[PDB]
Amino acid sequence: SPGIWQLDCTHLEGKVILVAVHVASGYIEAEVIPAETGQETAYFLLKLAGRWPVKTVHTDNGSNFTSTTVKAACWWAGIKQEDGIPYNPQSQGVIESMNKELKKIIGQVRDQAEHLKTAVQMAVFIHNHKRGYSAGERIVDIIATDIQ
Amino acid sequence: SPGIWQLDCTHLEGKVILVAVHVASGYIEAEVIPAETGQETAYFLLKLAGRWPVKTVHTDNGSNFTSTTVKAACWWAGIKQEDGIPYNPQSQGVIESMNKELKKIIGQVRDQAEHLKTAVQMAVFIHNHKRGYSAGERIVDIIATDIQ
Numbered sequence: 001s002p003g004i005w006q007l008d009c010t011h012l013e014g015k016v017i018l019v020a021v022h023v024a025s026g027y028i029e030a031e032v033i034p035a036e037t038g039q040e041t042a043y044f045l046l047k048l049a050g051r052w053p054v055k056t057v058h059t060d061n062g063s064n065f066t067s068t069t070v071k072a073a074c075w076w077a078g079i080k081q082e083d084g085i086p087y088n089p090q091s092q093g094v095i096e097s098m099n100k101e102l103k104k105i106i107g108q109v110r111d112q113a114e115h116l117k118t119a120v121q122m123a124v125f126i127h128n129h130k131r132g133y134s135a136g137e138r139i140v141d142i143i144a145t146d147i148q
Numbered sequence: 149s150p151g152i153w154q155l156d157c158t159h160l161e162g163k164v165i166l167v168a169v170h171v172a173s174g175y176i177e178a179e180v181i182p183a184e185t186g187q188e189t190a191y192f193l194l195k196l197a198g199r200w201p202v203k204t205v206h207t208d209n210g211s212n213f214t215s216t217t218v219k220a221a222c223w224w225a226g227i228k229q230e231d232g233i234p235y236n237p238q239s240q241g242v243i244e245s246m247n248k249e250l251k252k253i254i255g256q257v258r259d260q261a262e263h264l265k266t267a268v269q270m271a272v273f274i275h276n277h278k279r280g281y282s283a284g285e286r287i288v289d290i291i292a293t294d295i296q
């Protein structure tokens with residue numbers, strides 16, 4: 001559970017926002033890309049796994065699950081690549097609610113920057129700091145408890 | 149001390165590698181950019197502070213220290229922007245040694261990818277996982293101890 005992440009892809013302004021959620025904490029990382037490709041997803045996962053101890057990734061769709069480039073990145077980074085089938089039906093709603101929240105925050109800051117990527121990183125910051133513990137606090141505590 | 153980071157700028161293949169080091173752990177984040185500008189540095193710090201609890205940043209040079217865009221990003225993200233004067237003379241050597249190590253790793257993986265940015269993220273991964281604890285383990289433990 002400390003090492004479990006979920007990929008999520010949402011759309012805004014004709015661009016793609018790729019999100020990784022640490023399932024146990026709600027902590028996120030995100031990036032803007034022109035379109036979701038295997039190569040972009042693979043690079044995103046490489047970045048993620050260099051920064052946090054990623055054991056398992058539930059992929060966001062079948063194309064990324066199938067992608068040999070994504071499989072290669074997961075091999076390289078020591079990640080178990082899994083499907084994202086919501087065996088628990090509450091998973092759909094949770095991700096739906098997160099995308100809605102994220103877009104709301106992006107709207108609240110969108111005029112503080114020209115580029116969507118800047119607004120998305122502001123939204124990541126606000127989400128991860130929001131308190132009673134924050135997602136940023138929870139992920140660190142969860143992983144530290146695991147290490148020891 | 150848990151919140152203290154240092155910026156570092158190094159060059160390879162006619163490009164710039166921008167690095168943030170968590171001083172107490174040696175944990176790093178890095179990105180490739182075509183050139184170091186205030187805007188690029190500001191965006192990099194915004195990303196960093198959304199991901200880790202950044203209290204203080206020692207800037208890498210006077211241009212980034214002076215930059216109103218960098219100052220604005222630090223204001224936005226709640227970061228105390230400081231100079232990077234090595235009051236401790238061992239700081240020069242430590243960063244020098246880190247850039248050398250990073251470039252060595254980049255060389256060891258450079259043929260596993262076309263794009264320099266990919267090789268740099270592989271290097272970040274290897275650095276942060278290298279064991280006796282790893283830098284990734286140390287940063288989580290340091291911050292978790294602080295939170296509690």
Ligand SMILES: COc1ccc(CNC(=O)c2cc3c(cc2CN(C)Cc2cccc(OC)c2C(=O)O)OCO3)cc1
Nearest residue numbers: 111112113114115116118119187188190191194217220221
């Ligand atoms: C992250 O450091 C920051 C520092 C200050 C601010 C304060 N905001 C502004 O000054 C502003 C507001 C706007 C605008 C254009 C700007 C100025 N830019 C240069 C900010 C910026 C800076 C760096 C990278 C960026 O993107 C890679 C962008 C970006 O614009 O996205 O157009 C509509 O409202 C926002 C971000």
Ligand SMILES: COc1ccc(CNC(=O)c2cc3c(cc2CN(C)Cc2cccc(OC)c2C(=O)O)OCO3)cc1
Nearest residue numbers: 039040042043046069072073259260261262263264266267
């Ligand atoms: C983390 O995802 C990875 C998965 C597998 C691999 C294995 N390596 C290769 O297959 C390879 C080796 C090469 C090469 C070109 C490639 C193929 N590319 C598409 C890899 C790649 C993928 C994604 C984004 C990328 O860059 C944004 C790049 C990139 O090339 O930088 O040219 C010289 O040696 C490397 C990375």
Ligand SMILES: [Cl-]
Nearest residue numbers: 051052053284
């Ligand atoms: Cl790690």
